[PDB]
Structure formats: C-alpha cells, structure tokens
Symmetry: D3
Subunit: 256 residues, 6 copies
C-alpha cells in the first residue's frame, strides 16, 4: 500500500472547491457505509451530539474508508486528549466545536502538532494514523495532510473572528446557525434578518481572509443561500432527519 | 407491571384490520428506535436477509418496546432451535420464510407450542418472554398471544396453498413477490401479468380462507394494488432503501 | 407518538412524595430491564462507579423505557461535555457527584440550559432527547422537564450547603455517605455517631429549604432511619450487592 | 503457562462427589464474573434458553476463568457444528439438550471426538481449546479432559433411558423436571405429585448404571429431595430468578 | 460508486496465478485491518474454527475493504441458511468445509444461485452484496463474480474427488491437511509419508481437471512443497500463530 | 475466593527485580488473552494511544486475569475521573502519561488515594476492585497493593525530574524516548545519538532516588542498553508491531 498520506478533502479545500456534506448521527458503522454509497463529498461523523465512543468513531472510519466520500470527525470537545484519540485513529480532518477565542484556536492547533510546534503525544506511528508503520516518516508528512476546521457559533466567537482567522494552522471556519442564533438573542429562530445578516457577513469575511467557510443547512433553500454567499464546505442534511422524514412520507401515503 | 400477555398486532389481525408495516434491515437498535417514532403499525426486524445475531434481535425488541409500532421477527429460517431463540426473547409475532408444504407449516406450528400439542422446550418462564416470572401462568396464556405468519414464495408453495391455509395455528400467509416471481420463471420481473395474476388470486384465496394476507411492496402503486386485493398486513418499504433514496434526493439538489 | 415532554420522577419529587430507588451497577441493558420489572420508583444508572460508556448508558435507557420505574443518570463527573452527552440521549433526571460549591452548582445548571438561560449547545433536535423532532418545541419545553440532583458528599460541600440550596435550578440534594464519611476522616465508617449526626442535620436542612433530600442506604435499618429523618428520594439497594447476597444465601443451603 | 489440560468438574464427577451449580441466564460477562465469586461448584452458561451468541459464550468463559467455579456450556442444540464451535473455544464440559434416543446420544459423542473415532472438525491449535498451542499434544490429551452431560427430559427420552445409559462417552444424564412434566402432560407447577416417582426412579437408575445424575431444582425443598435420591450434579438456582426475587424482597420493605 | 461487480481473486484464479494467503483467526476487525496492510493476495476470515458471528464477519469485511488483499469467507458449515447470510453481506469468495460428495457440492452451488439456476432467496438488493442497489442488475451480474472453493478433507471426500471436480460452479478444491490426516487415521501427523503422498496426488488431480488447487501450510517447507506440487491458492500462515511466535521470540531475547 | 489483595508487579518492583513487558495496542480482549500465554512479566494495556473505551479496558483485564502476566493500565490522561474509573475496575498498576511537574505528580498520587489523604471517589465495593465485597476491608488494604508509575517524557518533565522523584507515592518513573526526543527537537529515529546520554543519566538518577526506572524500547539493541543502565520495568515490543513484522516476514518467503 501507499507510503504517502493524502487528504483529498484538504486538497479540494486548498483548491477553493465546493464540497457537499452530510451529518452522520446514528453512531452506526452499518448506516455510515450505506451513506458513503451516496457520493457526498464529505460525511460528518458527529462525536459531539450523537453518543459515539472512540470505538464507534473507529468503526465508522473503517466503514467509509473504501468509498469516495471523505470522513470528518467532530469530537465531544476540542480538548488535548480527545483530539489525541481521534488523530491517532487516522481522522485526518477534524471539526472542532465551540472555538470562541484566538487562544483557544492556537491551543487546538497545538493539540494537533507534534513537538517543536505543538503538544501532540507520539504514538500514531504504530496506530491506524500511520497504518501501523506502512506510512513512512509519518511525523514529517503529517501536518501537510491534517485539515483543521473550527466552529464559530457564539457572539464571543464572532467578536473574535478576525483574530481566529489569523491563527496559523486553521484551514476553515464553520458556522453553526442554531447555536449562533441562540447566542445572538434569537433561540429557535435562525430565520431572523439580524441572524441571516450575521451569517452572510461572517461567510464573506471568512472567504475574504483566504480560509474555507462552512455551514450546516438542513433546509435546502438555506444551503443554496450559503453557497451563494461563498460557503465552500456545506453540509446539507442530517442522515437521521432524512431517514425519519422519508419514513413519515412513505407511511402518509397509506394513512387517510 | 401487567401479568397478562397481549399481542396488539394479533388482536388487530383477528379483527380483520389493515396494518401498515416497514422492513428494518440495518440490524441496529439505534435506527429501530428512530423508525418506531414514525408510527407504522408493524416493523419487520429482518433476521433473514440482514446480518442480525440473536442479540441484535434482542436489542431491536428493547428499542421499539415503549412505542406503539408492533415488532415482527423474521428468523434466518423456521427451524426448531431458531424459533426457540426468538420466542424465548419475547417475539410474539413471527414471519417464517420458505414455507412450501403443509407438513413444513405443521412443524413450524409445533416448534411454537409446548408439549401436549408441540415441541417447544420450556425455559421462557425465566426469560424475557414471561418477563422473568412477572407473566403468571405463561404456559397457559401463551398460545392465544402468539401470532404466526408464513411466507409462500415458491411455485411449490402456491401449489400447496390450500393445504397450508388449512393448517391449525397459522394466522397469516405472506407473499414475497420477488422470490415468487423468480420461482415462476420470471427472475427480476414481478411486473409480468402472469405474476400479478398469481399474486392477486393468491391474496384473494388467503382472505377467502379466513386468514390474514401479507405482502411487501416497495413501490407504493403495488402496495395500493395489494391493499385493494385484500392484503391486510402490508409492508410498504425497506428502511435502508428509504434512507438511501432520501440521501440521493437531497444530494441531487446540489450536484448540477 | 406523544409530542410532549414529561418527567414523572420530577412531578413526584415536587409533590414531596417518597420515591424508593435502586442502583444499577452492572452496566448491562440485560439486567437493567430485569430490574425495571420490580417496579422501584427510580433506578440509578451509575456512570460514576461502574464502567459505563455513553453507549452503555443509552442501551440501559432503551431497556427500562417501557416500564414504570424512572431512570436517573449519574455521569462520571459533572463536566459540561459529559452533561451535554447525557442530556442529548434523553436522560431527563441527572444525579451529579461531588458538587462542592454554589459556583459549581450554578455551572451545572448552566450546562443544562440553552441560551439565554445557560451554555447548552443545540443538537438534541436530531437526537433521542427530542425523539428526532417528534417532541415539538423541545427548546421551549425542556427546562420544565429536566430534574437536577446534586451530591453533597464532602466537608467542603457541607460548609457550602446553604449556598448550594439557594441555587436556582437545583431540585434536590443527595447526601453520599461513602464519600462524605471518608471526607470527614471516618472512611468506611459511615455508621459513626458523628457522621450519623451530620447526615440527620443535613437531611433536615435540605428539606427546610424546600428541596428534596436524597440518600443511598444499602442497610435497610439505615434506609428506614433516613426516611424517618425526612429523605424523600432514597435508594435502598445496589443491584449487584443484592445479586451476590442472593447467590451466597442459596448456595449456603447446600454447603451447610 | 501450564501445558496440561485438566477438568476438575469431570474429576469430581468421576469420584461421585456432589457438585452444586447455578444457571447463568443473563448472557453477560459482567454478571458471570460476579457470580463466579460465590464459589458454586459449577455455573451453567445457558446458550439454549438465553440469547447467547458464540461470542457471549466466549466472554463468559473469559470472565469466570480465574475463579474456582467450573463452567459448563449448554449450546442451542447438540448439532455437529454447534458442538464444534463450543469445543474450540475451550468449553471442556457440555450440557446437551433434547437427547431422546441412544442413536442421538452416540451422534453427540461422535461430535465431541476427532476422526477417525468421531466427527469433530480438527482446528483447536488455532483456538482457545489448546491455548493457541500452549497445550502440547492437545489431540492426545483431549478425550480425558472432556465431560459430556446429556438431557433426558421428554417422554421418548425416558422410554429410551436404559439404552442411552449404555452409550459409551456419556458421563452424566440430566433430568429437567419442567420439560419432562410438560412432555408427560403436566404443563407447569413443574414436578407435579404424579411425576416425582418417575423422577426418583430415573435418578436411581442413572446412578445404578455408573453415570452421574443431574437436575435443576429452583425450589430448595425439591433440590434436597433430588440429592437425597442420588443426584450428584445439581443446579439449585437461576441467577436472574435469584436477582429478581432479591430485588422484590428489598423493595417490599418500603412498600410495607 | 462503481455499479459493476468484480472479483479480483476469481480472475486471478481463472488465469491460474498463484495466490498467497493468510488465515485470520482472532475474529477482530482491528487485527483484520492490520493484516490487510501486509498485502497477502488473500485473507481467510475463518468462521469455522474461530468464534465469529455473522456480525464479526461483516466487520472484518468492512475492515479489509479498502486494501488490496481479497477476503475469503469460511462459514461454520456449508448449509443453505449460513451460505445465504454470507452471500448477502457481500462475501464474493467462499471456502466451504467438509464437502464429501458430488451431491453436497451441487447443493452448495445451488445455495449460491438465484432461480432458475439454484435455491438462493432474494434480498441482496437491500443488503451489502448489491451495495443497497448501487450495483445495478445484481441478479444478472452475480454468478460471474462469485467464486466457490470447496474443502476435500476426509476419506469420503477423496473417494469422490473426480465426481466433485466434475460439478459445474466449483472453481477450486482445497485440501485440508488437519482434517484429512485425522480422517485417514493419522491425526496430528499430516507429515506422515502416506498422507504427504495422498496430498501430492490430490493436488495434481485437481489441477488436471482444470480447477484451482488449495492448501494451508503453517510450515514454510510444506508450503513451498505444495506450491511445487501445483497448488495455486495457498495459505501460508495463521495470524494468531504468527503473533504468538513473534511474541515468544522477542521475549526469549530477555529471558536468555 | 481469596479475600486478600496482592500486587505481584509491585512486590517485584520493590525487590528491584527486572520485569519484561509488552504493549497491548489492539484494544481487543481476544488478542490480550493470546498475548498473556507468552508469559511476559507485564502487559501494558494502552488506553492512551489505542482507542480503548473503559469497557475495552475491563474486557482485557478479564481476558488476562487467570494468566501469570501482570496487567498495567495506561488511561487517556491522568485526570481524577479517569483514574477513578480505572481504579474501580481493579487496575492495581497504573502508567500515567505526561507527568511534567512535581505538583502534577502530587495531584496524580492524590487521585489514587481515598479521602481524607487523597481525592479518589469512594465506591469500590460495588465494583471489580473489591471483587464486589469479597475483598474484606478494601479501603484498609488498597494503598499497599496499588502501584503508581509516571511518564517523564518532555523537556519540562526532565527539568523537573529531581522534584518529581521527591514526591511520595510514585513507585516508578518511565521514560518514553520518542516523546522525549521530539520534545528535545528530534522528531523520529526515536533516541538519536544526541539524547542517549540525557536518557542514561535519567535512568541512573531514577534508580539513585530509590525508584524503579521504566522504558519502552522496540529495538532489542536499545532494550539491552537501557537494562544495562539500570532500567527495571522495560517493555520490549508493541504487539501490533510484532504482528505486522511477522506477517511481512512470512509473506516475504513467497514473494521471494
Ligand atoms: Mg453547534
Ligand atoms: Mg422472500
Ligand atoms: Mg459518592
Ligand atoms: Mg430442558
Ligand atoms: Mg478442515
Ligand atoms: Mg509517551
């Protein structure tokens, strides 16, 4: 097998390319493989808001591996040890929740990088990340193939957006509209013109800074709008929601 | 908790009532609970064509238990020991594949009944089926609450349909259109007029014999047609197919 | 299904009713279901002193769901991300260990509330807590249906007991005799007059603040005593201890 | 490690010693370890009436391995492949259900022995049975350390008892009184006034033919009786029953 | 994704290429993936002599899927329902143990084929075999991409070897030295001149019929010999044996 | 069962005996048992750089329990709650990563001791640590049987080595050469020509302060050297590395 790491999601992001994603929220490797057969550009394995253990995450990576869709892992939080776990299992693209400050953003980057630059503990070289040694010179190759995406989803984070965007090692900034809406004084209502204005300017600011801009839009109209605004890693649904809706729609054909 | 067993699916079947179902093919308790929130009348936990162990089946029963949707279990085959396993875990409604003869149908019934009448081994009385003893006089109550559905899905089985329909202990006969189509000399094409004619007469014969008639129709048009013909336990989709289709439909909105 | 949240444990607690409970310590969904058939008022699913993963917790919730006994979840610690995980899986009643200050208690409340009331990140809409959107207006209903119980189980905690009892959003204070005893310099001797004294006074003070008073007593004598002292959410047993004792007692009939 | 096979259960059986046992019915490795700390002489890991997979059986063997209590495995049925599976995982004592004829008993014996004497499939050096080759000359050692117990628990099996007792390789004959009573036309109450005699005579006949005699008696009164009669491998409880009873008993102190 | 079935193992086999393989005996997806990074031509996932459930088999397939090594699945026995399960999860190459007669061999082929060609029940359309409908015209493509290997590993099997080699649908015949040796009256002594002789003649006869000839040799000397004799699907190791030996060899450097 | 705690690893450490170890990196109970049959002195169950959940850790302890090899658990980090979890499951020897200061070392020691001396949460009588109460006076016995090893593997930790060595309750100090080399500015090649001296001096300093000295050396040449220097708990391989190498070596015989 190949001795070079590659991260196709990162490669595409660097080329400015638009990547269409789906949230995977069931924790199950069975459904992750099924979802991978759809051909989304990326799949967000949600270790934050679905009850995934580190083993569930591992199994979902193994499930999607031979398919074209690229996995992105969101851990429970961007702490040193939880980041350590997901990087060692060979998650090359991370989405980190609740990044509110440039200092938090620098600490997240430090957690992903080995000494000199960061604080990542050594051990991937004999784990899935270096494919048990088949990846030669893993410590030398790794930074170029790691892709780091941070969520800006509070009023504090928007206030700090420029500082965060200037942090070395951050590849993209993701806006989660429902948390942001809540924090801005409009809980349960991202549809308010103030919120929409903030979302649009924030996306444009992220792209203007040369970084990738991300979004989750479960309403296709909102997804089209964020794409128009320049978001270029956009998740367009949550698998469990698509599932439940499909189930309801089929059943409705037979019930009065 | 209650000392009486009840099988609402059987109660409704006895009353002639139409019951709308969905196949569950992921093996996962996580998705089974999600599907149960839809409100289908029944959910077919497929131990035949999805890789369910006896524990997967157990977990899916525990998942759906507090919801209104009634579970129906299909084992890998209707052998004595596999039937034994699923009855002891408290699956009160079974769908048995590949029942081709009245003798096979009698043997299936014998597998579900304790001595005098049948060959079921004792032990449920301390298992999930009798809720570890909370169900009093389980051996006396049980037959009235067990619901047995058999699949007629070959040319041999159709030839034997009258004999099968006269077998004591059989509550319903299910027609699987794709196996039947194959066996009738039309593989991959249930849409042939010969096959449709056989399906319609078979449904009408089953109802004319006072038994419930079942069908799986993944095309809603076919489901409506089988309902019109008198099928009264009709599965109208496979959850994994509904899932994949929903995923494809969402993605298509963003890809040219 | 039902679109409304309810919390029977919390309604009873608010009425000042005595609720008799049991610790579940095996991690197993299989034993959780068996225990639920006893009809204890509540079952404490122990994620602190038994090796439960978030998945084990989930499966135990699924197991007890159809039965009348109400689940309570104790996480390994009361941190923001661990509280997030248990809320999202739909645990409506939490027992939080080692709450030592009014500040820690406020932080715990904040971890359970969405903006503006706290720090809880959204995502329960696409998870078990909101039954995948079947619970309508979850964000609006949720605070009413969440029951928070905090453990006062150190010397520091006792010093701050009045300050803790004044924290809005705390429904009950639970005295942990094993940790408290040790904290006081009487490890493994909770029966000491000095400890029994402090337990009694602590219980009366909790109730005097209009909050529920909780306790675990593995000795029935002690359980009746703490009930006489005013404790109204009282766990009276640990299931693994009851198992071991029952097995020993049966064996001893044939070894003597 | 130790290169010798030993079977303390079989050695004590051969000495005619009385061995006191407990059914393990939860399928869980967690409860199997807890139960092993009681020091029963044997623990019956029930793969017939509890929903154990071969993996669950493996994990319960691993759990109990360091304790004094000797494991006995009952598979779902005594087929060649299912006996092959449980022998390969290092189950050295088997309890086989539904052995109704001498021809069946011979076929079970052959399934436990390698060719050319029997039909056990050869591959134990790549499994736990030979501790991955740490047991030297496993194929030489294995017959002497394997203990075969069959269940005679039907009318037909009773009619065939003498003949079954003449089959070489059977170490013990187990009578299940609830199965036999059902088979004799007494569904539940277990051993009725009518079949006590039929049971006693059998126990005495079994011991008379130089074989061990087995029984499960969940009533201590009945267990004393069967021992008085000559039964020397007697299971005296079912762990899930002992659990439920103990939970009920502790709770009744507070609903009193 | 790709809508076409292919079987690289089968294409190579048809070309008469030598394919070097490894037994996987741990049941673990974790070790299966590690093994796949070695680049053996094939990996034998052993459901006969290791305690694999259908789920363990599934997870091992998912693990090795992205790597070049091609999986082969051996079920616990070659029965119709066990073959059904492994085909449906998408195992394209099967190794069937203990095929003793031309009749058994025909039955195995029939178990792998849909009507009119055999008895296989439909349902792979909604399973991993057809990648949930992403493989278009599965029913039409499938026979071409299925590779059947049968074990000739008893005296009965040898007597019927020519009849077995004449069965249409068999791609390869595998000689099992452990079972064959025992069947011949030389258990645990496959090295006996009489056995080595019969292995050699058997290999030449297999190849003479235009079928592939298979073998497992845990001794490299024997492996080279069987290759020299004409065997072209040759497993050369059992992964758990290689693990144990490697661990012993490292330890021995510090114990001597 | 035996009511006394013992820690053979700690007893031998105290005697200054040399103990030879192996890293267990696969997370699987199946491989842990196989590895235990080699008779290494100790086996490091790696919960920091392999994706172990607390349940995986539990199952590997259960697997190795009856063998002579002594288990050592490394948790993801040495936080209070994670040390609480692993102590409660009966891990009596801990290896704690990233111990950089004396204050950290004191905080780790306190996390291992009950109040009022430390801050370990009290609940071991409802867990495996006290074998569910079969270990009498566990709280009395526990300090003497717990063995605490800390990792000093960074520039800061090195600067602080004397002070760390002065902390009471630390039984051994482990040096990880790849982490330290990275921290000192040598990413990979592990221990470079430049840091051998820094390593040797540390090993001698550790033993000089009356503590045990630890090392992982995957190169046998380096392992002999560190032993020559005074290291007395030395891991000499990583099981997944030994596996991969052995697989490669066997395969190379046929790609030759
Ligand atoms: Mg968010
Ligand atoms: Mg069918
Ligand atoms: Mg406590
Ligand atoms: Mg029986
Ligand atoms: Mg063989
Ligand atoms: Mg390190």
């Amino acid at each position: 097998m190949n001795a070079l790491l590659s991260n196709p999601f990162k490669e595409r992001l660097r080329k400015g390319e638009v990547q269409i994603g789906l949230w995977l929220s069931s924790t199950t490797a069975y459904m992750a493989e099924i979802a991978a057969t759809s051909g989304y550009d990326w799949l967000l394995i949600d270790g934050e808001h679905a009850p995934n253990t580190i083993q569930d995450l591992y199994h979902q990576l193994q499930a999607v591996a031979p398919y074209a869709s690229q996995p992105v892992i969101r851990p429970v939080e961007g702490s040193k040890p939880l980041i350590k776990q997901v990087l060692d299992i060979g998650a090359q693209t991370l989405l980190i929740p609740m990044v509110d400050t440039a200092e938090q953003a620098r600490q997240v980057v430090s957690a992903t990088r080995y000494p000199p630059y960061g604080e990542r503990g050594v051990g991937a070289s004999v784990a899935r990340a270096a494919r048990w040694g088949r990846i030669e010179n893993y410590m030398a190759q790794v930074n170029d193939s790691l892709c780091l995406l941070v969520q800006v989803e509070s009023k504090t984070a928007l206030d700090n957006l420029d500082e965060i965007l200037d942090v070395e090692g951050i590849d993209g900034v993701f806006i989660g509209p429902a948390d942001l809406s809540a924090s801005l004084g409009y809980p349960d209502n991202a549809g308010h013109p103030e919120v929409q204005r903030i979302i649009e300017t924030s996306i444009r600011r992220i792209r203007a800074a040369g970084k990738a801009a991300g979004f989750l839009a479960v309403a296709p109209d909102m997804a089209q709008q964020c794409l128009a605004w320049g978001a270029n890693f956009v998740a367009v649904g949550v698998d469990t929601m698509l599932y439940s809706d499909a189930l309801d729609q089929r059943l409705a054909m037979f019930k009065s």
